[PDB]
Paper text:
4C8 and 4E8 bind to purified, full-length CD9 as well as to endogenous CD9 expressed on HeLa cells with apparent binding affinities in the nanomolar range.
Tetraspanins are eukaryotic membrane proteins that contribute to a variety of signaling processes by organizing partner-receptor molecules in the plasma membrane. Among the 33 human tetraspanins, CD9 (also known as Tspan29) is an extensively studied tetraspanin that is expressed in a wide variety of tissues and is also highly abundant on the membranes of extracellular vesicles. We first present crystal structures of the isolated EC2 domain of CD9 in the absence and presence of anti-CD9 nanobodies 4C8 and 4E8, revealing the flexibility of the D-loop region of CD9.
Numbering used by the authors: 1 to 102, 106 to 121
The structure:
Amino acid sequence: EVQLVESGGGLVQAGGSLRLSCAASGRTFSDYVMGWFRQAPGKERTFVARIGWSGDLTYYADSVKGRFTISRDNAKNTVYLQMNSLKPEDTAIYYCAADERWGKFDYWGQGTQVTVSS
């Protein structure tokens, strides 16, 4: 099975930025669509962004499109989420996810906290 390990969470001031990363291992990384989800403490886990196998096709939730950028490096088995212009409402636990097909993902990371101070 594929293992996903997120990195890069932290505390940032409103208007700032963070880059999350997620390293996949155990199977050929280029066989998987990679996605990011987030769960705010009082809401259910919601979709953030996903990227196609080759890194060309990307899709973003309305609430983050234009501020967040998803990318991948298939030689490093890593997917990235560059989060710019952060808002307090971006505060959440962010989860990496993987699936061979393009809300259901077979594999999930353990989550990393992102806190945006007002």
